Amino acid sequence: NLRVLLDTAIPPSFCDTVSSVLLDDFNMVSLIRTSPADSLATIKQDNAEIDIAITIDEELKISRFNQCVLGYTKAFVVAHPQHPLCNASLHSIASLANYRQISLGSRSGQHSNLLRPVSDKVLFVENFDDMLRLVEAGVGWGIAPHYFVEERLRNGTLAVLSELYEPGGIDTKVYCYYNTALESERSFLRFLESARQRLRELG
Amino acid sequence: NLRVLLDTAIPPSFCDTVSSVLLDDFNMVSLIRTSPADSLATIKQDNAEIDIAITIDEELKISRFNQCVLGYTKAFVVAHPQHPLCNASLHSIASLANYRQISLGSRSGQHSNLLRPVSDKVLFVENFDDMLRLVEAGVGWGIAPHYFVEERLRNGTLAVLSELYEPGGIDTKVYCYYNTALESERSFLRFLESARQRLRELG
């Protein structure tokens, strides 16, 4: 009934929050997961009937939907600890556009500026697990959500190459594309203000 | 000698910081101001010889420059207190793309997705002062940096229409496009880490 989509860069905390809050005013809620490189294509397929989509991907105006922001999440470009581009860093951040990158692929073979790769050439994968399996072998470097790569980082399996580009991790807004019918529904504003208020408790 | 460009959305605090820190390792520093809708075009004109550019505008790869992020700044969509789209808000955020907008114009008549207007039609101006003079008359709504519009807000001259889109103000990364020669110059990394460290003291 209420069909909500949540991309894969959305940390499970952010998902738990969304879900629990929907659960206040909603009676049937379906929670679809998706790659961030297919979220926006998916909601566009009218037959998919997505009422709400929670994604890091950005596009100006989608047809039937409006956009706002729920919060912020972080991501790191990572690599194998003995990747050439480790440590040595100033010039290295430029050299990413040479070294090979493991990118998230889309069914529409298409990519926003936000998720377009930064280097030719690239190896595409469908999901973060496959990104990092590769990236753990030395096969490329990737961009990955904080949570997907926290553990591995502490355990020294992976290094971060992103600190000079943006110390602390790469920030990105988490967006809510919501079917326009929902604008001016009390349940939806309740969810919005609720989920939001709570996502500030995380940080 | 060191020619640094700073757009007009960069709060004067952020500028003071940049300037003072450059002043540590630099002996001649020229500080050029620019609209955020001309920063990137300007650095591209090879004859302008901009070594560093501090701007909110985003572009993937400029030719001779690299990109990183220095911090974050905030902006609000504002209007006259009795603008139609005041108060009443859920549906209203959608209706911006109808109501008339006062946008920042570019010499190249061209605009990034970041600064493209969101509604046809629009009135262009060259600068924030002219934006708000207009917007204070009821002539349109605009998007404006926090600092440019703080005072007016407290004084009730202007209302914010942006809170449901993103509570607290609209976040945007402040970017440093820096001539590639500067990568691996000690003075430049000193500045980077310095300016950066200090911009966290603001918030």
GROMACS .gro file of C-alpha atoms in nm, chain B residues 11-200:
model
  190
  214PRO     CA    1   3.068   3.430   0.399
  215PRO     CA    2   3.314   3.705   0.502
  216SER     CA    3   3.427   3.495   0.804
  217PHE     CA    4   3.537   3.212   0.552
  218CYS     CA    5   3.714   3.482   0.352
  219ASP     CA    6   3.890   3.631   0.653
  220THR     CA    7   4.015   3.284   0.745
  221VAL     CA    8   4.138   3.203   0.396
  222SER     CA    9   4.312   3.542   0.372
  223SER     CA   10   4.478   3.532   0.708
  224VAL     CA   11   4.609   3.181   0.658
  225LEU     CA   12   4.746   3.255   0.308
  226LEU     CA   13   4.919   3.544   0.467
  227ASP     CA   14   5.131   3.292   0.673
  228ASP     CA   15   5.320   3.139   0.373
  229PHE     CA   16   5.237   3.389   0.103
  230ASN     CA   17   5.402   3.716   0.011
  231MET     CA   18   5.179   3.857  -0.254
  232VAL     CA   19   4.811   3.756  -0.258
  233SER     CA   20   4.540   3.900  -0.477
  234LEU     CA   21   4.180   3.836  -0.364
  235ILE     CA   22   3.924   3.855  -0.646
  236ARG     CA   23   3.551   3.858  -0.580
  237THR     CA   24   3.300   3.705  -0.817
  238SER     CA   25   2.943   3.593  -0.848
  239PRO     CA   26   2.908   3.227  -0.787
  240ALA     CA   27   2.765   3.203  -1.134
  241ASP     CA   28   3.095   3.327  -1.285
  242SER     CA   29   3.358   3.167  -1.070
  243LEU     CA   30   3.415   2.861  -1.283
  244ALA     CA   31   3.397   3.038  -1.616
  245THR     CA   32   3.651   3.283  -1.484
  246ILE     CA   33   3.914   3.035  -1.380
  247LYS     CA   34   3.878   2.867  -1.718
  248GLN     CA   35   3.986   3.185  -1.907
  249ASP     CA   36   4.358   3.094  -1.912
  250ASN     CA   37   4.452   3.461  -1.932
  251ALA     CA   38   4.288   3.528  -1.592
  252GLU     CA   39   4.556   3.323  -1.423
  253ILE     CA   40   4.353   3.225  -1.115
  254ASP     CA   41   4.561   2.996  -0.892
  255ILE     CA   42   4.292   2.920  -0.639
  256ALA     CA   43   3.918   2.956  -0.650
  257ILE     CA   44   3.685   2.928  -0.359
  258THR     CA   45   3.326   2.875  -0.472
  259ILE     CA   46   3.009   2.690  -0.411
  260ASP     CA   47   2.970   2.598  -0.781
  261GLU     CA   48   3.041   2.245  -0.894
  262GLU     CA   49   3.183   2.092  -1.207
  263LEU     CA   50   3.336   1.751  -1.253
  264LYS     CA   51   3.686   1.807  -1.403
  265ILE     CA   52   3.799   2.153  -1.500
  266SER     CA   53   4.109   2.132  -1.721
  267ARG     CA   54   4.403   2.272  -1.532
  268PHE     CA   55   4.260   2.239  -1.182
  269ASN     CA   56   4.182   1.996  -0.904
  270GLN     CA   57   3.895   2.015  -0.657
  271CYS     CA   58   3.854   1.942  -0.291
  272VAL     CA   59   3.634   2.066  -0.017
  273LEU     CA   60   3.709   2.331   0.243
  274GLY     CA   61   3.384   2.342   0.426
  275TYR     CA   62   3.012   2.401   0.418
  276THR     CA   63   2.791   2.705   0.410
  277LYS     CA   64   2.416   2.758   0.413
  278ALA     CA   65   2.156   2.939   0.218
  279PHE     CA   66   1.789   3.004   0.238
  280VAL     CA   67   1.521   3.060  -0.015
  281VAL     CA   68   1.357   3.379   0.093
  282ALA     CA   69   1.073   3.604   0.008
  283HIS     CA   70   0.868   3.894   0.112
  284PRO     CA   71   0.672   3.825   0.431
  285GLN     CA   72   0.343   3.852   0.241
  286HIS     CA   73   0.454   3.665  -0.062
  287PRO     CA   74   0.171   3.426  -0.170
  288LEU     CA   75   0.395   3.124  -0.094
  289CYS     CA   76   0.457   3.232   0.265
  290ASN     CA   77   0.347   3.014   0.562
  291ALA     CA   78   0.127   2.760   0.375
  292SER     CA   79   0.419   2.533   0.271
  293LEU     CA   80   0.388   2.162   0.176
  294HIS     CA   81   0.229   2.218  -0.172
  295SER     CA   82   0.406   2.558  -0.181
  296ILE     CA   83   0.759   2.411  -0.211
  297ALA     CA   84   0.635   2.247  -0.530
  298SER     CA   85   0.484   2.581  -0.652
  299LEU     CA   86   0.821   2.765  -0.654
  300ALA     CA   87   0.862   2.626  -1.006
  301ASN     CA   88   0.563   2.845  -1.093
  302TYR     CA   89   0.618   3.162  -0.889
  303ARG     CA   90   0.876   3.397  -1.026
  304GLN     CA   91   1.235   3.363  -0.913
  305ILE     CA   92   1.523   3.616  -0.889
  306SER     CA   93   1.831   3.429  -1.016
  307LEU     CA   94   2.197   3.499  -1.040
  308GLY     CA   95   2.294   3.564  -1.398
  309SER     CA   96   2.614   3.461  -1.576
  310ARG     CA   97   2.822   3.639  -1.842
  311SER     CA   98   2.823   3.307  -2.033
  312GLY     CA   99   2.436   3.309  -2.015
  313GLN     CA  100   2.506   2.951  -1.902
  314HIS     CA  101   2.435   2.777  -1.563
  315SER     CA  102   2.542   2.461  -1.378
  316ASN     CA  103   2.261   2.235  -1.249
  317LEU     CA  104   2.360   2.369  -0.915
  318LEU     CA  105   2.274   2.731  -1.006
  319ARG     CA  106   2.022   2.687  -1.299
  320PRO     CA  107   1.689   2.844  -1.198
  321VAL     CA  108   1.412   2.613  -1.087
  322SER     CA  109   1.113   2.799  -1.234
  323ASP     CA  110   1.058   2.955  -1.568
  324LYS     CA  111   1.024   3.237  -1.580
  325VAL     CA  112   1.288   3.437  -1.395
  326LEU     CA  113   1.439   3.779  -1.366
  327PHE     CA  114   1.821   3.769  -1.371
  328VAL     CA  115   2.042   3.995  -1.159
  329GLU     CA  116   2.418   4.017  -1.127
  330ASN     CA  117   2.450   4.005  -0.754
  331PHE     CA  118   2.289   3.931  -0.414
  332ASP     CA  119   2.221   4.294  -0.337
  333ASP     CA  120   2.013   4.330  -0.649
  334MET     CA  121   1.849   4.000  -0.579
  335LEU     CA  122   1.717   4.103  -0.243
  336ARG     CA  123   1.629   4.460  -0.334
  337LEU     CA  124   1.398   4.305  -0.585
  338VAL     CA  125   1.292   4.024  -0.342
  339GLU     CA  126   1.222   4.286  -0.064
  340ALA     CA  127   0.984   4.457  -0.310
  341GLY     CA  128   0.757   4.168  -0.380
  342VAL     CA  129   0.894   4.114  -0.718
  343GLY     CA  130   1.017   3.757  -0.676
  344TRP     CA  131   1.168   3.489  -0.448
  345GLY     CA  132   1.543   3.411  -0.436
  346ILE     CA  133   1.806   3.180  -0.296
  347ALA     CA  134   2.059   3.367  -0.084
  348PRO     CA  135   2.350   3.298   0.146
  349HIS     CA  136   2.283   3.289   0.515
  350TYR     CA  137   2.498   3.589   0.595
  351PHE     CA  138   2.353   3.809   0.331
  352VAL     CA  139   2.008   3.767   0.473
  353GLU     CA  140   2.051   3.699   0.847
  354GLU     CA  141   1.989   4.062   0.954
  355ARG     CA  142   1.680   4.112   0.730
  356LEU     CA  143   1.537   3.783   0.869
  357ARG     CA  144   1.558   3.886   1.239
  358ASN     CA  145   1.425   4.231   1.143
  359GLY     CA  146   1.118   4.053   0.987
  360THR     CA  147   1.179   4.217   0.646
  361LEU     CA  148   1.204   3.865   0.486
  362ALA     CA  149   1.064   3.520   0.546
  363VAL     CA  150   1.229   3.186   0.465
  364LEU     CA  151   1.044   2.946   0.243
  365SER     CA  152   1.297   2.666   0.262
  366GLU     CA  153   1.245   2.486   0.598
  367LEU     CA  154   1.036   2.194   0.476
  368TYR     CA  155   1.281   2.141   0.189
  369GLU     CA  156   1.574   2.127   0.427
  370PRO     CA  157   1.537   2.238   0.792
  371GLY     CA  158   1.811   2.468   0.913
  372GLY     CA  159   1.911   2.603   0.576
  373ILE     CA  160   2.028   2.454   0.253
  374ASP     CA  161   2.368   2.306   0.294
  375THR     CA  162   2.635   2.343   0.030
  376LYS     CA  163   2.992   2.244   0.012
  377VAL     CA  164   3.243   2.517  -0.039
  378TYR     CA  165   3.496   2.394  -0.293
  379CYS     CA  166   3.860   2.480  -0.359
  380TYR     CA  167   3.962   2.453  -0.725
  381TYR     CA  168   4.337   2.482  -0.717
  382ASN     CA  169   4.586   2.499  -1.003
  383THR     CA  170   4.750   2.168  -1.046
  384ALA     CA  171   5.102   2.315  -1.004
  385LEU     CA  172   5.009   2.380  -0.644
  386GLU     CA  173   4.946   2.014  -0.568
  387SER     CA  174   5.250   1.907  -0.367
  388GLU     CA  175   5.355   2.261  -0.268
  389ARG     CA  176   5.403   2.276   0.112
  390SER     CA  177   5.256   2.626   0.132
  391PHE     CA  178   4.940   2.506  -0.033
  392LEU     CA  179   4.887   2.202   0.188
  393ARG     CA  180   4.959   2.422   0.492
  394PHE     CA  181   4.684   2.659   0.378
  395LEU     CA  182   4.450   2.375   0.302
  396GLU     CA  183   4.484   2.204   0.640
  397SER     CA  184   4.493   2.539   0.821
  398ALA     CA  185   4.188   2.706   0.654
  399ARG     CA  186   4.009   2.374   0.694
  400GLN     CA  187   4.085   2.317   1.066
  401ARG     CA  188   3.969   2.672   1.134
  402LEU     CA  189   3.643   2.642   0.938
  403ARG     CA  190   3.529   2.376   1.179
   0.00000   0.00000   0.00000
